[PDB]
Amino acid sequence: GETLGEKWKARLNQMSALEFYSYKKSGITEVCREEARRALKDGVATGGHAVSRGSAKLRWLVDRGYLQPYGKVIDLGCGRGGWSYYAATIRKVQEVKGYTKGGPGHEEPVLVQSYGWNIVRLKSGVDVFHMAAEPCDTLLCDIGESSSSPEVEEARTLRVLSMVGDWLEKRPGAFCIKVLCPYTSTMMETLERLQRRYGGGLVRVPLSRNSTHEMYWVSGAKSNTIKSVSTTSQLLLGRMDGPRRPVKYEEDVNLGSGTR
Ligand SMILES: Nc1ncnc2c1ncn2[C@@H]1O[C@H](CSCC[C@H](N)C(=O)O)[C@@H](O)[C@H]1O
Ligand SMILES: [Mg+2]
């Protein structure tokens, strides 16, 4: 019983290195992030330049009402902190706590002074899967590493989803959770069951590359799982045909400066 997403995964794996390369950015939405690129690679933040592409992904969802962060924000798997620092600029957000693994193969928090930096605390060296859940108003989680195997992507997603369940049981009023693999029938059933229990819906963020089927389970969406997943699968499959399309650019994120 093969889904569209599984056919996309199979075809993605059949691509030559050149085909994959041309495909992965074809027609996507993008932020250029030229302008403080060397500063970031040096490990010094510049003003209100975002520390990662993640700020733009969160911005895209917030600008469209897919969630309205407020109160105490928890950011699981914060990496460099792009989500935490974007959240700190939202008027109703009061406090941001980010946790991430860091160390060798992994992103360390970047320490910056974009607007609202002083209500942000990011901590490295923590395994979020070993943290007991805690009350919060806005729950964010951006964890899930890609794999050429769909069974692996699926298993990795189910572990993430089991982990956030403890946090959702605390009943945050807003959330945004990356779903690395939504495209197997087991995943779709699991996601429907989670939406029945916790609400929200799945959204494809168009700044995601075509090389990942990731979607975001967000409290401000209402979507049908089959509709949102199948539409994404069909978009990704369609971009495999025909000539390569250019990227569409948004304005770089500007998180300003100053305390709150
Ligand atoms: N068990 C775990 N505990 C803590 N962090 C983890 C983890 N598994 C993966 N991660 C971290 O989750 C992060 C996913 S990256 C998230 C991008 C971030 N939203 C931003 O905007 O910058 C990675 O840095 C990775 O190291
Ligand atoms: Mg940017």
Numbering used by the authors: 5 to 264
Paper text:
The MTase domain is highly conserved in flaviviruses and is responsible for methylation of the 5′-cap of the viral genomic RNA. In flaviviruses, the NS5 MTase domain performs both N-7 and 2′ -O methylations, using S-adenosyl-l-methionine (SAM) as a methyl donor and generating two S-adenosyl-l-homocysteine (SAH) molecules as reaction by-products. ZIKV MTase is composed of three sub-domains: the major MTase core (residues 54–223) contains a Rossmann fold with seven, mixed, β-strands (β1 to β7) surrounded by two sets of α-helices (αA, αX and αD, αE) on each side. The MTase core provides the binding pocket for the methyl donor SAM and after the methylation step, it houses the by-product SAH.
